[PDB]
Design a protein around this motif. Sequence first.
Motif, PDB file in Angstrom:
ATOM      1  N   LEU A  78      15.538  -6.566 -72.369  1.00  0.00           N
ATOM      2  CA  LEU A  78      16.595  -6.390 -71.374  1.00  0.00           C
ATOM      3  C   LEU A  78      16.411  -7.314 -70.171  1.00  0.00           C
ATOM      4  CD1 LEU A  78      19.036  -4.880 -70.000  1.00  0.00           C
ATOM      5  CD2 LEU A  78      17.420  -3.073 -69.394  1.00  0.00           C
ATOM      6  N   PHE A  79      17.351  -8.242 -70.006  1.00  0.00           N
ATOM      7  CA  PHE A  79      17.369  -9.142 -68.854  1.00  0.00           C
ATOM      8  C   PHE A  79      18.229  -8.562 -67.737  1.00  0.00           C
ATOM      9  CE2 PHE A  79      16.238 -11.962 -72.344  1.00  0.00           C
ATOM     10  CZ  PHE A  79      15.221 -12.728 -71.788  1.00  0.00           C
ATOM     11  N   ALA A  80      18.044  -9.080 -66.521  1.00  0.00           N
ATOM     12  CA  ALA A  80      18.727  -8.573 -65.325  1.00  0.00           C
ATOM     13  C   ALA A  80      18.698  -7.045 -65.305  1.00  0.00           C
ATOM     14  CB  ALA A  80      20.165  -9.105 -65.253  1.00  0.00           C
ATOM     15  N   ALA A  81      17.485  -6.500 -65.379  1.00  0.00           N
ATOM     16  CA  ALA A  81      17.266  -5.067 -65.576  1.00  0.00           C
ATOM     17  C   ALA A  81      17.662  -4.207 -64.374  1.00  0.00           C
ATOM     18  CB  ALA A  81      15.816  -4.807 -65.963  1.00  0.00           C
ATOM     19  N   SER A 107      13.775 -10.976 -61.901  1.00  0.00           N
ATOM     20  CA  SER A 107      13.294 -12.115 -61.115  1.00  0.00           C
ATOM     21  C   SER A 107      12.189 -11.755 -60.119  1.00  0.00           C
ATOM     22  CB  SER A 107      14.459 -12.800 -60.389  1.00  0.00           C
ATOM     23  OG  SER A 107      15.161 -11.889 -59.558  1.00  0.00           O
ATOM     24  N   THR A 108      12.179 -10.504 -59.660  1.00  0.00           N
ATOM     25  CA  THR A 108      11.231 -10.061 -58.634  1.00  0.00           C
ATOM     26  C   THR A 108      10.499  -8.776 -59.030  1.00  0.00           C
ATOM     27  OG1 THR A 108      12.799  -8.705 -57.336  1.00  0.00           O
ATOM     28  CG2 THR A 108      12.726 -11.074 -56.840  1.00  0.00           C
ATOM     29  N   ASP A 109       9.337  -8.549 -58.417  1.00  0.00           N
ATOM     30  CA  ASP A 109       8.576  -7.312 -58.610  1.00  0.00           C
ATOM     31  C   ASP A 109       9.321  -6.102 -58.049  1.00  0.00           C
ATOM     32  OD1 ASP A 109       6.553  -8.664 -59.912  1.00  0.00           O
ATOM     33  OD2 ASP A 109       5.141  -8.607 -58.235  1.00  0.00           O
ATOM     34  N   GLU A 110      10.095  -6.333 -56.989  1.00  0.00           N
ATOM     35  CA  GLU A 110      10.917  -5.301 -56.363  1.00  0.00           C
ATOM     36  C   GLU A 110      11.997  -4.793 -57.321  1.00  0.00           C
ATOM     37  OE1 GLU A 110      10.980  -2.744 -53.341  1.00  0.00           O
ATOM     38  OE2 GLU A 110       9.796  -4.586 -53.195  1.00  0.00           O
ATOM     39  N   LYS A 111      12.620  -5.718 -58.048  1.00  0.00           N
ATOM     40  CA  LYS A 111      13.630  -5.376 -59.050  1.00  0.00           C
ATOM     41  C   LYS A 111      13.015  -4.699 -60.277  1.00  0.00           C
ATOM     42  CE  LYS A 111      17.252  -8.738 -57.893  1.00  0.00           C
ATOM     43  NZ  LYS A 111      18.054  -9.894 -58.384  1.00  0.00           N
ATOM     44  N   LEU A 112      11.787  -5.091 -60.618  1.00  0.00           N
ATOM     45  CA  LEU A 112      11.053  -4.480 -61.730  1.00  0.00           C
ATOM     46  C   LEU A 112      10.622  -3.048 -61.417  1.00  0.00           C
ATOM     47  CD1 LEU A 112       8.822  -7.477 -62.891  1.00  0.00           C
ATOM     48  CD2 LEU A 112      10.609  -6.405 -64.281  1.00  0.00           C
ATOM     49  N   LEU A 162       7.392  -4.305 -68.322  1.00  0.00           N
ATOM     50  CA  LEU A 162       7.932  -5.120 -67.234  1.00  0.00           C
ATOM     51  C   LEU A 162       7.437  -6.563 -67.293  1.00  0.00           C
ATOM     52  CD1 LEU A 162       7.341  -2.618 -64.242  1.00  0.00           C
ATOM     53  CD2 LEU A 162       9.488  -2.870 -65.509  1.00  0.00           C
ATOM     54  N   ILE A 163       8.364  -7.504 -67.123  1.00  0.00           N
ATOM     55  CA  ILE A 163       8.040  -8.930 -67.055  1.00  0.00           C
ATOM     56  C   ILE A 163       8.720  -9.563 -65.843  1.00  0.00           C
ATOM     57  CG2 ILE A 163       8.058 -11.179 -68.242  1.00  0.00           C
ATOM     58  CD1 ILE A 163       8.495  -9.607 -70.891  1.00  0.00           C
ATOM     59  N   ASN A 164       7.932 -10.238 -65.010  1.00  0.00           N
ATOM     60  CA  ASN A 164       8.478 -11.039 -63.920  1.00  0.00           C
ATOM     61  C   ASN A 164       8.866 -12.420 -64.443  1.00  0.00           C
ATOM     62  OD1 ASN A 164       8.666 -12.799 -61.483  1.00  0.00           O
ATOM     63  ND2 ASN A 164       7.988 -10.951 -60.401  1.00  0.00           N
ATOM     64  N   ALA A 165      10.158 -12.730 -64.366  1.00  0.00           N
ATOM     65  CA  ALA A 165      10.705 -13.978 -64.905  1.00  0.00           C
ATOM     66  C   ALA A 165      10.207 -15.227 -64.174  1.00  0.00           C
ATOM     67  CB  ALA A 165      12.229 -13.933 -64.900  1.00  0.00           C
ATOM     68  N   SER A 166       9.901 -15.076 -62.887  1.00  0.00           N
ATOM     69  CA  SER A 166       9.469 -16.191 -62.045  1.00  0.00           C
ATOM     70  C   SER A 166       7.979 -16.506 -62.174  1.00  0.00           C
ATOM     71  CB  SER A 166       9.806 -15.908 -60.578  1.00  0.00           C
ATOM     72  OG  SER A 166      11.197 -15.702 -60.400  1.00  0.00           O
ATOM     73  N   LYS A 167       7.186 -15.495 -62.524  1.00  0.00           N
ATOM     74  CA  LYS A 167       5.726 -15.607 -62.495  1.00  0.00           C
ATOM     75  C   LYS A 167       5.065 -15.641 -63.875  1.00  0.00           C
ATOM     76  CE  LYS A 167       5.177 -13.398 -57.955  1.00  0.00           C
ATOM     77  NZ  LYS A 167       4.555 -12.273 -57.203  1.00  0.00           N
ATOM     78  N   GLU A 168       5.761 -15.127 -64.886  1.00  0.00           N
ATOM     79  CA  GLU A 168       5.169 -14.946 -66.214  1.00  0.00           C
ATOM     80  C   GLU A 168       5.904 -15.711 -67.313  1.00  0.00           C
ATOM     81  OE1 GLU A 168       5.126 -10.350 -65.137  1.00  0.00           O
ATOM     82  OE2 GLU A 168       3.889 -10.693 -66.919  1.00  0.00           O
TER      83      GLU A 168
END
Lengths: 332, 331
Positions: free
Chosen positions: A152-155, A179-184, A195-201
Amino acid sequence: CTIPEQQKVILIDEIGGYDVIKYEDYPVPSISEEELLIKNKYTGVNYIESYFRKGIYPCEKPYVLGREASGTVVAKGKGVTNFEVGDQVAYISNSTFAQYSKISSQGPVMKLPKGTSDEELKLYAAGLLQVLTALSFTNEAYHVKKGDYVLLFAAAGGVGLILNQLLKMKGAHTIAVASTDEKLKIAKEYGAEYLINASKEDILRQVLKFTNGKGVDASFDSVGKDTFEISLAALKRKGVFVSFGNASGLIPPFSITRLSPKNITLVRPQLYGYIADPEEWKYYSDEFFGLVNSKKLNIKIYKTYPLRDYRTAAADIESRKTVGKLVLEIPQ
Amino acid sequence: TIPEQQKVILIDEIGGYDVIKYEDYPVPSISEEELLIKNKYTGVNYIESYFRKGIYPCEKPYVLGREASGTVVAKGKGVTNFEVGDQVAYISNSTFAQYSKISSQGPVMKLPKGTSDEELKLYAAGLLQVLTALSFTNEAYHVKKGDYVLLFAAAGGVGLILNQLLKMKGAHTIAVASTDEKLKIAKEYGAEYLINASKEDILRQVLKFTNGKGVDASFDSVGKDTFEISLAALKRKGVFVSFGNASGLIPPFSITRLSPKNITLVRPQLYGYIADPEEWKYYSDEFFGLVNSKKLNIKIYKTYPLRDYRTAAADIESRKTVGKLVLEIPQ
């Protein structure tokens, strides 16, 4: 009920900035034998209105904004038998940024129980588009099964928040990407298992790790161009790619033989194609009612604005940093 | 005992029918989990024409053939699921030969010892086409009773099995072919509605047969020239199944075109549906039940000796040909 001939609406006469948004006097629409006249209480804000205002998408001017709303039937046509005057409703129609709107009684309108509170009505107006999309996409685009690993993207987005809850309810294992840990954090709160951070992982690497190198049964991807290759590689053999939303329209032309190595099924659905038939509307709106009425599903609201203050809501959503639905309230 | 050399059909280079060579070649050795199979029959597939023309790359000398039936003459010391003397139908490499090999855990199935020579020919002729048609109508798009299904290349190998399966499932086939003679055979094999692509407006006829609603699914192996027709012919929420070599020549596709009617797109290939031992068992058993019982007929064109594949290659590349071409292996 006494029906006025003039009302207040939010409309645009021309293309431009926020200054072109008008809270103005406008006619109350006349209704046909089969139609309902609805006095609006709440209406959901969609990003598409920004595209109309900026002139990215064309529309006939004057254009009255809004599609999803909740309110009270104040008048009905002579042939209407499935609704009564005073009934509380949620619906999808035209020109809902208004004190009064109309819809066919045979169209996408749902009846709500007597004594539905204003707060409950707000939830229906806020959730209509996102929940019906999430239900139909997980029922028909790809039928989610118990035990499914689902990417699931844009979770933390509108549809994504409902998908987190729905996939959890179906006994699926949701791998949420944001995109962010806050959104995750919000994704996890709404039922995400991974959970996966798109910007960091490395997204593909983590998906394979969680699925033991096998991949996901399905990908619900509304990010589009930047994640197309990832989704395709992340899918299990015989997996299903569900591409959706405005961003998926940016995906470059695709050689269909690339679906072959893993026998991947591809779908790019839109909501209206799953609720075109009265039988289809009944099915999904009944399920939607079940989820909201029972309070099993949370509909996250960012902020509620007065109808005349849409300019502020428009500026808020276009910042692209809002989480939760933006809703307009119409004073009675 | 097993000889050291054998007769095979191979290509040393890319070209016309002159590059097809009937030559002496080593008999393959087998490892601990492999079977050595003495072939009796092998099915001719259009893929061999793609290797010869240079459409698909291959290391040369390249021994042709993937689909065969015969008898196990040797096995590795670890093989427990097969015995020497067992009659088999299988998919592997280099089957245009007296001897080929396969892993005992690969796409190979045991046949009853009572299997006749005529049945051996039938299994080698029908293996790939039936497995393709079964898996495509089960998983690519699961055909339901009462479905209206558009079928291109209706008198082709996969097409003739599709006609039969769709009829068996209680679906209503709209068959498309280039000639009336081809449509005639399609009808006899289960097709209900017939469209001559050379003479008729395909989309107009489909909408007539379905009362303007369109088809639940399209099985389209014609590719580029029918892609627009297939997409337009589909009902709302319909499923587009594109397959075969012609799918590769379809220009890059903008996926937003699937949205107005919520169309599902699949470009499947057989081997993705038989990758698991359990999956192979499922479909190969289904294949056997249907072909052995004659519930599915395998339309044959001609049988050729292995040495005469040159003629078979010309026959299959000719459009007027209807039915499977089979090679008889010298014993």
